[PDB]
From a paper:
Our current understanding of supercoiling in bacterial flagellar filaments, referred to as polymorphic switching, is based upon the notion that protofilaments within the flagellar filament can exist in two discrete states, that differ slightly in length. The “short” state results from a protofilament having a right-handed inclination (the R-state), while the “long” state results from a protofilament having a left-handed inclination (the L-state).
While the three L-type mutants (E115G, S285P, and S17P) have a left-handed 11-start helix, the four R-type mutants (N226Y, A233V, [name] and A39VN133H) have a right-handed 11-start helix, and the designations L and R correspond to the hand of these 11-start helices. The first atomic filament model (R-type [name]) was built de novo using an established Rosetta protocol, and the other filament models were built by RosettaCM32 using the [name] model as the starting template. Similarly, residue H84 in [name] is not conserved in terms of sequence and subunit-subunit interactions. We also identified several straight mutations that are only involved in the 11-start interactions: S17P, [name] and A39V in the double mutants.
Residue numbers in the entry:
A (entry chain W): 52 to 254
B (entry chain M), E (entry chain A), G (entry chain K): 255 to 304
C (entry chain A), F (entry chain K), H (entry chain J): 3 to 51
D (entry chain g): 52 to 152
The structure:
């Protein structure tokens, strides 16, 4: 009994610790979401300034956007909880090889297998993900915007220099971040629920 | 967040720890009372001698 | 009956009430009910969009 | 007499122990009930967002719900009183075969 | 209109949330008082020993 | 008359009173009369619904 | 309205329940005093032996 | 629970609100939303031109 009791309280501590890890990652992704919001604003504004302003001004917009990218990588790589750099692709959700997923095992209960799995990925190349991001598309859209001159070259009828494609893929990156944050919120709800059961059982 | 984890390791929950303080004291007081009872047997041994 | 008192539902409900009050402030100081993705994950995603 | 006396007090201890087992299971089911409450909320909200929001957003709601499911299984399988995993279907109320209840 | 919906998801109704704050606090204070009553039984146990 | 004193109604009523006081705190610290399904099973189910 | 009914099932009237808490405690204290009186008869039995 | 209180989301949201109010005045006293290049870098460059 005692074994499982003290082990159970320790498991609850472990769970709260997992929650706070999620708090750090969640804050990083919150800020990432603010960045991507600003990016989308610049994409829309770039969209009209395919008429209004020149490749010089579009290049200024690109300066800002590229800086914002560099910050996204900066979040992905500086973000550490007790040194744990998470947002990097080390903890990809599902590699081609399941052996290389590097899944995250939080211990949750006192006994064997009373644990879970967690994964995460966001970085510069977090645009639309097929299995890789893609080649000329779905990677730069987060990393290197097309907002250099290429909107002055053509409207949305190209899909590689088209405005619609651009805006779409940005919105999809947003949907991946939003999805990740949503999952994490669910997970910490799960954890808290469990911690209630752990403390109860402990009593 | 790190502050929270730090505290969970470092900061004691002084409610529970107060209860443990209470408990350990009363166990000490009780224990002493048990000594005061323990050390009275020999004097009735003396009553057998006296 | 005192090696392990039974008044731990007391402490657990206490940590729960204090947890709640904390969350309350986290909402009020910020002015949000979605200050954290565990408050409302679904509505968070929606609100994002 | 003595036989039945000490046996009787032991039986009462045994009964209290059974109660506390029930306390554990009851707490697990309390939490399960909170989960299911949240689920129902998401179902209602999903109901109106058959108009308001898209299959992407419904998919986000599904992400949360699926997580909550996974927690229900997590309760059913992590829940143990001295190792006794109860909520699992091992102790089904009434199998087709009464021998396997 | 979208601002309204955003707020209904995001913005808390701080009136109700204030009332919940009030409530949770007083439940905490009450709970602590119940601890202060809980931890006084053992000392009358001592009175049985002493 | 002392191998087994008759003052066990004393102790049983004592454990009963202490049990009651425990339950009282369990209600007061939480603020519920249904903190546990044995308090009121029927009303629990209803309240659920 | 449903909140009201919910509370009437769920929410305890902590005034009355406080009074019940008071009562149960004092019954415990009294009971213990009755034990302290109960367990003093045997020692006058000893006075008959001694 | 008091060696390190958990009421730091309080202070962080406070410094954030005060930061915002500062920025608000910086805009209002000047009468600009581009008083500083971090407000809007892109629109700053454009506005320059």
């Amino acid at each position: 009994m005692r074994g499982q009791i003290r082990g159970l309280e320790m498991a609850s501590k472990n769970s709260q610790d997992g929650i706070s890890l999620i708090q750090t990652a969640e804050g990083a992704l919150t800020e990432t979401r603010a960045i991507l919001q600003r990016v989308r604003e610049l994409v829309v504004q770039a969209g009209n300034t395919g008429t209004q302003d020149k490749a010089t001004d579009l290049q200024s917009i690109q300066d800002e956007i590229s800086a914002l990218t560099d910050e996204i990588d900066g979040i992905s790589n500086r973000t550490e909880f007790n040194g744990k750099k998470l947002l990097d692709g080390t903890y990809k959700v599902d590699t081609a090889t399941p052996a290389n997923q590097k899944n995250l095992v939080f211990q949750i209960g006192a006994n064997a297998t009373q644990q879970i799995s967690v994964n995460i990925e966001d970085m510069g190349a977090d645009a639309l993900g097929i299995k890789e991001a893609d080649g000329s598309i779905a990677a730069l859209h987060s990393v290197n915007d097309l907002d250099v001159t290429k909107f002055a070259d053509n409207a949305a009828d190209c899909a590689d220099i088209g405005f619609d494609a651009q805006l779409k893929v940005v919105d999809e990156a947003i949907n991946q971040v939003s999805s990740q944050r949503a999952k994490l919120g669910a997970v910490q709800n799960r954890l808290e629920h469990t911690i209630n059961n752990l403390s109860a059982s402990g009593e | 967040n790190l502050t929270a984890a730090e505290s969970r390791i470092r900061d004691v929950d002084m409610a529970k720890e107060m209860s443990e303080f209470t408990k350990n004291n009363i166990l000490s007081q009780a224990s002493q009372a048990m000594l005061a009872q323990a050390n009275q047997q020999p004097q009735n041994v003396l009553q057998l001698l006296r | 009956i005192n090696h392990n008192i039974a008044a731990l539902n007391t402490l657990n409900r206490l940590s729960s009430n204090n947890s709640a009050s904390q969350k309350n402030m986290e909402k009020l100081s910020s002015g949000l009910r979605i200050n954290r993705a565990g408050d409302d994950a679904a509505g968070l995603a929606i609100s994002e969009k």
